[PDB]
């Protein structure tokens, strides 16, 4: 069965860039019809969709963060890598990686990791 696990640094300097990984285990991402996306929720406010990638190498990013984020996949090790740039204290949030389908928008969510900005 599928577990979504997030890994990466929690404290980041604002000038420095951020990298994050989600090591999904339990589905082959190459199956036709399944995607995977990223959702962040800053404390005190609602969630925020980041981006999502498809099985056949089709990538969809957020309307504002096209340059900020980049996504890539590795089905051999069953991992996905996301890169975020020039983050802000408002951007500090809990991050989740999630399976995505068409009928059911989002079904299973990873436990997530906190991200905060300081020195």
């Amino acid at each position: 069965q599928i577990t979504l696990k997030e890994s990466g640094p929690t404290l980041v300097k604002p000038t420095q860039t951020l990298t994050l990984t989600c090591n999904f285990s339990g589905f082959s991402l190459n199956t036709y019809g399944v995607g995977v996306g990223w959702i962040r929720q800053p404390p005190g406010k609602a969630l925020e969709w980041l981006a999502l990638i498809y099985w056949d190498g089709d990538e969809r990013y957020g309307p504002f963060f096209k340059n900020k984020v980049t996504i890539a996949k590795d089905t051999s090790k069953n991992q996905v890598v996301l890169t975020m740039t020039n983050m802000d204290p408002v951007d500090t949030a809990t991050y989740y990686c999630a399976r995505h389908l068409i009928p059911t928008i989002f079904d299973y969510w990873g436990q997530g990791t906190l991200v905060t900005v300081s020195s």
Binding site: A46, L47, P63, Y96, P103, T104, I105, F106, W109, Q111
Partner: protein, 109 residues
């Protein structure tokens, strides 16, 4: 964004109570895809509604939903101690693939 949702709703255990998520009809479009998730603290949320008045495997029959003209209403019957959580609305939109709903916390006594 341009989508809203009332945050707090209150009721009494053993009875039925409802909350709604509301937005603009143009952004969500003709096709609804109304969805609702629950989130108690200290672990990740899961899905309880994926289609109009529809619930996947691992059912909880007390759940119910209904899609009005511009809103989606979630109704709960026979409340117990598990209601004290935050419930998020989520619908497909046209100009972007956004939901951006605040979520609905529940109160009971």
């Amino acid at each position: 964004s341009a989508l809203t949702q009332p945050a707090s709703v209150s009721g009494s255990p053993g009875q039925s109570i409802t909350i709604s998520c509301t937005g603009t009809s143009s952004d969500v479009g003709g096709s609804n895809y109304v969805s609702w998730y629950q989130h108690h603290p200290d672990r990740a949320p899961k899905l309880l509604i994926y289609e109009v008045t529809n619930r996947p495997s691992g059912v909880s029959n007390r759940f119910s939903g209904s899609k009005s003209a511009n809103t989606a209403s979630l109704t709960i019957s026979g409340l117990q101690a598990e209601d004290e959580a935050d419930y998020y609305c989520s619908s497909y939109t046209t100009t972007s693939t956004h939901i951006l709903f605040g979520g609905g916390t529940k109160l009971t006594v």
